[PDB]
Design an enzyme around this catalytic site. Structure first.
Site, short mmCIF file in Angstrom:
data_model
loop_
_atom_site.label_atom_id
_atom_site.label_comp_id
_atom_site.label_asym_id
_atom_site.label_seq_id
_atom_site.Cartn_x
_atom_site.Cartn_y
_atom_site.Cartn_z
N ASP C 164 80.84 67.46 63.87
CA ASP C 164 79.86 67.35 63.85
C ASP C 164 79.42 68.37 64.16
O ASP C 164 78.69 69.08 65.01
CB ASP C 164 79.99 66.84 65.32
CG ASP C 164 78.47 66.12 66.39
OD1 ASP C 164 78.09 66.38 65.58
OD2 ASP C 164 78.88 64.57 66.67
N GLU C 194 72.83 70.69 71.91
CA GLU C 194 71.88 69.11 70.87
C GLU C 194 72.84 68.14 71.85
O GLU C 194 72.25 67.16 71.97
CB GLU C 194 72.47 69.24 69.75
CG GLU C 194 72.10 68.09 68.85
CD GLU C 194 73.09 66.87 69.08
OE1 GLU C 194 73.85 67.06 68.88
OE2 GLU C 194 72.57 66.06 68.48
N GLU C 195 75.11 68.26 71.75
CA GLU C 195 75.04 67.53 72.54
C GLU C 195 75.07 66.76 73.88
O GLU C 195 75.81 65.85 74.11
CB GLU C 195 76.95 67.92 72.34
CG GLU C 195 77.16 68.04 71.39
CD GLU C 195 77.46 66.72 69.80
OE1 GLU C 195 77.32 66.04 70.82
OE2 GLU C 195 77.70 66.73 68.98
N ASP C 217 72.49 67.13 60.51
CA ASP C 217 74.09 66.67 61.20
C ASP C 217 74.97 66.00 61.15
O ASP C 217 74.21 65.31 58.94
CB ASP C 217 73.11 65.95 62.55
CG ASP C 217 74.18 66.51 63.60
OD1 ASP C 217 75.04 66.88 62.94
OD2 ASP C 217 73.17 65.65 65.12
N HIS C 305 82.90 62.50 66.90
CA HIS C 305 83.77 63.32 68.31
C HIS C 305 85.25 62.97 68.30
O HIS C 305 85.44 62.58 69.37
CB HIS C 305 82.69 62.27 69.01
CG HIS C 305 80.87 62.98 69.31
ND1 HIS C 305 80.11 62.48 70.64
CD2 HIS C 305 80.58 63.44 68.73
CE1 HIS C 305 79.20 63.34 70.01
NE2 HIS C 305 79.29 63.61 68.84
ZN LIG Z 1 75.70 65.88 65.27
ZN LIG Z 2 78.23 64.46 69.09
#
Ligand SMILES: [Zn+2]
Ligand SMILES: [Zn+2]
Ligand SMILES: [Zn+2]
Ligand SMILES: [Zn+2]
Ligand SMILES: [Zn+2]
Ligand SMILES: [Zn+2]
Ligand SMILES: [Zn+2]
Ligand SMILES: [Zn+2]
EC number: 3.4.11.-
Lengths: 335, 4, 335, 335, 335, 4, 4, 4
Positions: C164, C194-195, C217, C305
């Site tokens: 990810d 970003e998460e 991404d 994830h």
């Molecule tokens: Zn991502």
């Molecule tokens: Zn993510």
């Protein structure tokens, strides 16, 4: 009480979020250009119509995007699967006719079928296979809107697709036509992507850097059977709604009362609006840069976010009138 | 109208 | 098809949101500096690698932060309680091994234990008391990541922690190595946080003020057993995914089709992506200042994830190739 | 493949159960009179078109009534409450436009609003009070139909209100036009009130006292996403459906196979139909007096009982062809 | 406003479905014979009273059967088990007194006991064993009715057992007494077994073969506390109810409006009736042979199907008056 | 009144 | 990937 | 089509 032909042009032009350029954009430009000094289209697609004047710089925003659907997959037997563009309720898609846009100014009919959730919804366009659906012009990403048209309901009301702000687009077009030598530097903005997050209002407001901000949108009119009186929000025909606050913004109290006093002085019918939730372009405008004092005038509307939204011409006229009076007197406003 |  | 050693370096370096400086930051700087004119680290920790060129200013963002855990409390008997950094699912923490970071470049092992909710989850590091856990270097605020390593799955696939986007970090490193005399002023950005809300992308984009924005991404690849065909989103090995829209952004239609046409012209495999939810850095980039037209290329990934995310090298190569071609031809793009 | 203009005339004429005289009746009479020897309207309103011939007396029935709504109460604020005429599903009334019939050939628009049950449904016609609604022409007993129109879906399909047998009315009109010197005494009957209990078919069949009975109606086409193959019933485009049995009738086995053999001999596409429930005019015809051997040909239709029913012209043509061949050869039939 | 003594005679005479001959039959014959030319009892027990006249043959039906109970089993200790005759609700049998009919004109008291369902209901007649219950005259098949009597409620209302049409029987007796030299061939029919399926109306109508049919029955008056205004159906004291439609019949629109116009012209109070369900004798009459145009006048009644039904004398008088006027003017009716 |  |  |  309203310019019916103009209203029809604005509500029936396609323009789902992110794809306003397919129809509504050109309608707004064509209908407003002769009443302003310059018209420009920015990066995200917002239509900015500038009417030069001596006074505070004022931004008036009405979103031109409408909710709709986007094709996510084409089944083996030609049926289409979709994702919502904006807050679409599956209950409003069942046994409904749609316009599937295969190109700018070109559409084919579709039928929505199969409380319903998204993985149970599909569109039938008469294709027998994925290949046939593709030959008909459909692809992943194809946008779709309801097949709706403007019609009259009784003496003062109307039914239509996309009043959820095409009625506000109509309003600013009318305000632009009425405004004469106003002591203000006016920027009329037909914003993009309001239905997915007040996106166009955010970027256009940043570029304009206004002294005052105003949004015009529809608000909930739940004055229908079975609704407790305190939960009706607004009533059709009782006037333009002056927004005190919604989930996205607490309108500047000075502007709220200034608008209320202006309405009283000019005998313009009005009502006060408070929403527990909901969001409007003002929610983005007022948080621009170092802050922008804002107000919002709303057109009461029943059955919002459907192919059968309903408004009352008396409230629309009141909104045009109050916004016009606000622009003519804003040079005196002291916050 | 976001939401409704 | 990919530089395995480089990929291993980027996925195995620790760097949870807000703490990217503990490992991934230095890896990105070291691996990209010789291919750009200057490398800078901004206020929030974003790594901005500038490659000077004559043409539109373009920002390409890949987030370097990964999801993880943070110690919230140390129980009397030495067990650790945690809070998630990013969208972590408790089901992925049970009977798993972890690296508990006690210092930069220093970790001790931990075991996750006890559908599970957060108040039922705990980490065992072999301590017998709170005092012993503290002597071992653990404190409130200690960050933790899964004990994951890159491995191959069959002929073209891989399994790893943090694909990810470490796969996107790998991608921009490869693009930077391939880009030669591009007619564009390029800013490669390894974004932070970003998460937890597309935070690094927001601040770096503001400072760069690009003419065009691109995010790289991972996207959902649900082409697994039991998933209806229309809900698979993307398929591994079928190409780089060109994003039409996700919950955070509606990619500029002109850029979307421009990328699709470029892929066809250069025979680069691709697939179109639409997500009902999800969010990407583009969601922040496009709303910067007065607006930025943006596009996004995604690497299809299964089991996102978790400590066992899976990608296909053919899609990774396609992403490197298409982004490189986009940068070489963006000077001709007319929006 | 079909006479589009004629189909449009029959599906768009109003004619809810018991009130067929308001529109559809006259359309049927006008379009069939020049092809028969005499046309009569009986006690309940059935249109009986007799084409004299030498042979068995045959009754062919297609119901002309459509499902709809009837005003049961006018609320204080002008909203209308309704009761269903026929098997109407509340889910098909939400956010829909309606034609509220205030007189023969005169209607005003209405909007349906507020899974939904009947006491939650209401119609908005733009009135502000009960008195205004009454001045607009509405009363207890006012009938209402959806605002639907015929449109094409792809190469061979169509979408429309009331295919549920207006497609059969169209079929018998076409059969009457094609039939030439048939060895049979034919009685084409556009029956009333089928949707509320096969009522018109019962009384007209009693008066005609036919030797053979045939009904033409729509049948379930559930060849849509998510439906198990064995539950699809019929498929669009695969031919006219020869009914073996439904909940209201077990078609005479000799006639069923005779029709199947006729279809094979004349190369007319067909499919066999069996319904666990459902009811058709044949259910009344076959139990007339001392009994009447009957058969039924059905037009496969998707989304039955809605404003967006869908049929395939190839199945419609097959139905016209097979019924015509049946009438031309029925003099040879030996039961 | 009503002939109280006559009403008492008709409501208190026993006559459950299929067993009308035990009491009500003779009362109807005795009270109507002197006002007609001939009285006959048909196969099923319908009382047909013919009043010769020059004009259309008209059938006016009022069912004389009432709901009740039938003994299905006698328990070892003398208690009785029962089955319903007609639509009886167990809630209306608890702690109630009953008349257990052991012979024509002979009854013994019983007490209902033990929401309740049928296998929990039983009747206590004071017996100590099955043998004693049998010696008292009870057997399998013994019929039972509530112990109800007519009484007045205020100035214009009444409470009684079996208004559910004994009020209509009273009405036709009054109409027969008022009718003088009517231009119509009238057949007054006290029908049997309406409560179990409109059975008597079906067979008597077949034999009479009328040109016009009329039913007189009670309809729902739910103008009581807690009922939404749109669900009240009819209001006591607001006039005779002209039926537009119920689940068993859609009254001929021409007759409906003809009756409404007659009511207006003669200043007879009336109200329009629409029922989502319910069934009346007209449901059988109109489907007789080749069809019979029919209408229905109803007497609003509260608490239908109980020992305490309530009606308003003003509505009863209006029904007698309108039916009388209808018969006197039906010779002019043009359908 | 069948039903009610 | 926010969300998944 | 009674029913559906
Ligand atoms: Zn991502
Ligand atoms: Zn993510
Ligand atoms: Zn809006
Ligand atoms: Zn909206
Ligand atoms: Zn009754
Ligand atoms: Zn009854
Ligand atoms: Zn039908
Ligand atoms: Zn039907």
């Amino acid at each position: 009480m309203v310019d019916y032909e103009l209203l029809k042009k604005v509500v029936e032009a396609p323009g789902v979020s992110g794809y306003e350029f397919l129809g509504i954009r050109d309608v707004v430009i064509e209908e407003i250009k002769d009443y302003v000094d310059e018209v420009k289209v920015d990066k995200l697609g917002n239509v900015i119509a500038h009417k030069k004047g001596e006074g505070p710089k004022v931004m008036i925003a009405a979103h031109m995007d409408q909710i709709g659907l986007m094709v996510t997959h084409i089944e083996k037997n030609g049926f289409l699967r979709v994702a919502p563009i904006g807050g679409v309720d599956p209950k409003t898609l069942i046994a409904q006719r749609f316009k599937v846009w295969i190109d700018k100014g070109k559409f084919i009919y579709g039928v929505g079928a199969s409380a319903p959730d998204w993985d149970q919804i599909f569109i039938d366009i008469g294709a027998e296979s994925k290949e046939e659906a593709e030959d008909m012009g459909v692809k992943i990403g194809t946008v779709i809107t309801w097949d709706g048209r403007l019609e009259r309901l009784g003496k003062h009301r109307f039914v239509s697709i996309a009043f959820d702000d095409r009625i506000a687009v109509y309003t600013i077009l009318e305000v632009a036509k009425q405004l004469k030598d106003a002591k203000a530097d006016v920027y009329f903005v037909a914003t993009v992507q309001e239905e997915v997050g007040l996106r166009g209002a955010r970027t256009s407001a940043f570029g304009i850097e206004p002294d005052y901000g105003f949004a015009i949108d529809v608000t909930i009119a739940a004055d229908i059977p079975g609704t407790p009186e305190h939960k009706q929000v607004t009533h059709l025909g009782k006037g333009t709604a002056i927004k005190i606050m919604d989930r996205s913004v607490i309108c500047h109290p000075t502007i709220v009362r200034w608008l209320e006093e202006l309405a009283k002085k000019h005998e313009i019918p009005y009502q006060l609006e408070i929403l527990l939730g909901g969001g409007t372009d003002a929610g983005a405008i007022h948080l621009t840069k170092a802050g922008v004092p804002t107000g919002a005038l709303s057109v009461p509307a029943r059955y919002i976010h459907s192919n059968t939204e309903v408004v009352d011409e008396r409230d629309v006229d009141a909104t045009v009138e109050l916004m016009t009076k606000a622009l003519e007197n804003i040079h005196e406003l002291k916050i | 109208x976001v939401v409704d």
